Design a protein around this ligand. Structure first.
Ligand SMILES: C[S@@+](CC[C@H](N)C(=O)[O-])C[C@H]1O[C@@H](n2cnc3c(N)ncnc32)[C@H](O)[C@@H]1O
Ligand SMILES: C[S@@+](CC[C@H](N)C(=O)[O-])C[C@H]1O[C@@H](n2cnc3c(N)ncnc32)[C@H](O)[C@@H]1O
Lengths: 240, 238
């Protein structure tokens, strides 16, 4: 009940992937999350009018009509009640989702997600109704249902009582479990015979070095402390 | 047939979102894409089908046990047959997925995608078995299932007959009616001039990219025409 999510999508049953499995499923059961779907085809003027129509100016593919989406939105808005509802359109043209963005969206009382299909939705719907556009990344998907699900999953993790990378702006350290030896590779001895301060310094150093190796861009936008500059310089020199 | 995909996951039923819907479901039907699931819970040794284990060095959470993962991977590789399969682990620590990455992945004949759960998987498993690590973006999800599905959806779209190419954001889209609640479709699109439609679209694409994602333009080699249409878009707005 702490977070109310409404999804506008022509494939509402596709959302069983999050309503029936994982953290999102557990959060629904616990009442932390409320999830509802709104099929635009149930909001056409008459049952003989489809959700899509030919694009103006031509070109390959079809475009989603404004009235079905408008109908679906209005109905979802009514169901949200007395909650501050943010209307998100999932689009590659939107703001890139990051852990910082996830933390913000987690503060919202209610969210209404517009999952588009075909070649996109009519600009006039975006202008009039869409509050914020959001992208899950710089790649093209066939529809906005997996992006909407990616957002719901990321946000649900932050809900209190529902349960790290980018929490500190760094990649995570490697993880190890039983047995102590597997395929001739042994667990770093510090993880087996170390104190919490040894384990903390090895984890921060591994996180810094992995970020430096793979995602240097994450460092150019992060301030390295005295300790970190030294843990990092050491990682670089001891790499292999 | 064109592309074979093996998924290592403890929630294979989540993959109904791609096996039953869209281009992926169509590609399966048309035989362009083969989609299979390999559940580590089946490759267990106990009654309760334990797939997680405590982490070395303390801390909260659990790590995925190597043996159930190795088992599921082994069987996925056997089913891949004689196909050259690239083993990918979905994680926030991986190479960031972009359209250019999608095109690269679309050249592979087989993909085995490993979907993590909990706090992650054992690094020794990754160093030994994983060819490549891929992220869908700078955020943390509860599992690798949605990222694996995003990857397959993106790649399937590039399969022939399936249904950031320009390196720009796209132009707005308009459909019937001509006029809706005091808003009307740009007249250029209501005309039949295929050259004026093209020019207007390329300008709106250049313009939207300049306004929102100037980073995509800094890496782009703008043509003589493109530099003119973009300048025009900038000078002509409030
Ligand atoms: C073929 S696609 C996008 C086509 C094109 N970029 C456009 O909108 O002009 C149709 C739907 O997929 C969704 N989508 C595709 N990629 C996405 C992404 N990377 N992030 C969020 N949504 C995406 C959007 O909801 C869009 O309506
Ligand atoms: C809670 S996460 C683990 C995050 C953890 N900090 C780590 O060390 O990877 C569980 C699983 O989600 C998947 N995952 C989470 N975010 C992802 C992302 N942004 N890109 C690709 N996969 C992701 C991975 O398979 C990961 O093992």
């Amino acid at each position: 009940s702490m977070l109310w999510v409404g999804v506008v999508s022509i494939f509402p049953e596709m959302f069983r992937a999050i309503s029936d499995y994982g953290i999102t499923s557990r959060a629904v059961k616990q009442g932390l999350l409320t999830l509802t779907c709104w099929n635009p085809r149930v909001y056409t003027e008459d049952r003989h009018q489809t959700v899509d129509d030919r694009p103006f100016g031509g070109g390959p593919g079809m475009v989603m009509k404004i009235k079905p989406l408008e109908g679906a939105l209005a109905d979802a808005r009514q169901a949200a009640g007395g909650r501050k509802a943010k209307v998100i359109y999932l689009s590659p043209q939107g703001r890139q989702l990051t852990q910082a963005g996830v933390r913000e969206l987690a503060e919202e009382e209610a969210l209404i997600l517009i999952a588009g299909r075909y070649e996109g939705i009519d600009e006039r719907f975006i202008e009039e109704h869409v509050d914020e556009e959001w992208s899950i990344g710089d790649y093209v998907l066939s529809g906005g249902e997996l992006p909407a699900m990616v957002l719901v999953d990321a946000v649900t993790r932050l809900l209190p009582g529902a349960l790290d990378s980018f929490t500190d702006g760094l990649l995570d350290c490697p993880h190890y479990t039983r047995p102590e030896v597997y395929a001739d590779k042994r667990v770093p001895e510090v993880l087996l015979s170390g104190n919490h301060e040894h384990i903390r310094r090895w984890r921060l150093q591994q996180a810094l070095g992995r970020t430096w190796e793979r995602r240097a861009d994450l460092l150019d936008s992060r301030s390295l402390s005295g300790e970190e500059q030294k843990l990092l310089a050491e990682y670089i020199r001891q790499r292999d």
